[PDB]
C-alpha cells in the first residue's frame, strides 16, 4: 500500500483504560497487569474487557498507524466512535460503533455482525490501520507480509468522532502477557 505518508502519532489515554492495564510512560505501549493497577474508577473506563482508547480524535481526513502484536495469542484492534458503551458486555460490530479485526484461538476475524473469517498465510507481527473519514473506509494491512491487505470495511457510517481502539486480551493461558506497542513512524 501507499498510505504511509498519512502516518499519525497515536498515544494511549490512561483515563479510558480498564483498571488492570499498565500503560508505559511514553503512552505508546499497553499490557495486561496481574492485578488491579490501583487507579480510581470513572465513567470512561472499559469495565468488562482489557480495552483502552487512543487520545486522538478524528472527524476528517486520512490517518494511518501501526501496532506491534508480536507473540500475542489474542487481541482486538481498529477504531471506534468516541461514544461507544464502556460498561457491561457488548460485541464489537459497526452497529455498536466499532471497526475492528482480532486474533482469537489461532484464527483471525473481522468484527462484522456476524464476524467474517480472514485469510492470513503469514501471521502478522505488526498491523497497519488506515482510516479515510470522508470515504467511510477502514483498512487493515499485514506489515510482516509486505503490507498485504487483510480487510476493508467500506460504506462505514462513523456517525461521530473516531478514536483508535485496542484490546490486549485476557491472559488465562499464561501465553498472552506481551504488550501492544505503537510502532515509530
Ligand atoms: C479475569 C477477570 C479480570 N477482571 C478484571 C479486569 C480485567 C479486564 C476486565 O476487568 C481479571 C483477570 N482475570
From Swiss-Prot:
Induction: Up-regulated by IFN. Residues 8-185 form the B30.2/SPRY domain. Autoubiquitinated; does not lead to its proteasomal degradation. Deubiquitinated by USP4; leading to its stabilization. Autoubiquitinated. It is found in: Cytoplasm; Cytoplasmic vesicle, Autophagosome; Nucleus; Cytoplasm, P-body. Homotrimer. Component of a SCF(SKP2)-like complex containing CUL1, SKP1, TRIM21 and SKP2. Interacts with CALR, CUL1, FBXW11, HSPA5, IKBKB, IRF3, SKP1 and VCP. Interacts with SKP2; the interaction with SKP2 does not depend on an intact F-box domain. Interacts (via N-terminus and C-terminus) with DCP2 (via N-terminus and C-terminus). Interacts (via C-terminus) with IRF8 (via C-terminus). Interacts with ULK1, BECN1 and with ATG8 family members, including GABARAP, GABARAPL1, GABARAPL2 and MAP1LC3C/LC3C. Interacts with TRIM21 and SQSTM1/sequestosome 1. Interacts with IRF3. The coiled-coil is necessary for the cytoplasmic localization. The RING-type zinc finger is necessary for ubiquitination and for the IRF3-driven interferon beta promoter activity. Interacts with SKP2 and CUL1 in a RING finger-independent manner. The RING-type zinc finger is necessary for ubiquitination of NMI. Belongs to the TRIM/RBCC family. E3 ubiquitin-protein ligase whose activity is dependent on E2 enzymes, UBE2D1, UBE2D2, UBE2E1 and UBE2E2. Forms a ubiquitin ligase complex in cooperation with the E2 UBE2D2 that is used not only for the ubiquitination of USP4 and IKBKB but also for its self-ubiquitination. Component of cullin-RING-based SCF (SKP1-CUL1-F-box protein) E3 ubiquitin-protein ligase complexes such as SCF(SKP2)-like complexes. A TRIM21-containing SCF(SKP2)-like complex is shown to mediate ubiquitination of CDKN1B ('Thr-187' phosphorylated-form), thereby promoting its degradation by the proteasome. This is E3 ubiquitin-protein ligase TRIM21. The chain holds residues 291 to 468 of 470 of the full protein.
Amino acid at each position: 500500500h501507499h498510505h504511509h505518508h498519512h502516518m499519525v502519532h497515536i498515544t494511549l489515554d490512561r483515563n479510558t483504560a480498564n483498571s488492570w492495564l499498565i500503560i508505559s510512560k511514553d503512552r505508546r505501549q499497553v499490557r495486561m497487569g496481574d492485578t488491579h493497577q490501583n487507579v480510581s474508577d470513572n465513567k470512561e473506563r472499559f469495565s468488562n474487557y482489557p480495552m483502552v482508547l487512543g487520545a486522538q480524535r478524528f472527524s476528517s481526513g486520512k490517518m494511518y498507524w501501526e501496532v506491534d502484536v508480536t507473540q500475542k495469542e489474542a487481541w482486538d484492534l481498529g477504531v471506534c466512535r468516541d461514544s461507544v458503551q464502556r460498561k457491561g458486555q457488548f460485541s464489537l460490530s459497526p452497529e455498536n460503533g466499532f471497526w475492528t479485526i482480532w486474533l482469537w484461538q489461532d484464527s483471525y476475524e473481522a468484527g462484522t455482525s456476524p464476524q467474517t473469517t480472514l485469510h492470513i498465510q503469514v501471521p502478522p507481527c505488526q498491523i497497519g490501520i488506515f482510516v479515510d473519514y470522508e470515504a467511510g473506509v477502514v483498512s487493515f494491512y499485514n506489515i510482516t507480509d509486505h503490507g498485504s491487505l487483510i480487510y476493508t470495511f467500506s460504506e462505514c457510517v462513523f456517525a461521530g468522532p473516531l478514536r483508535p481502539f485496542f484490546n490486549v486480551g485476557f491472559n488465562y493461558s499464561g501465553g498472552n502477557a506481551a504488550p501492544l506497542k505503537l510502532c515509530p513512524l
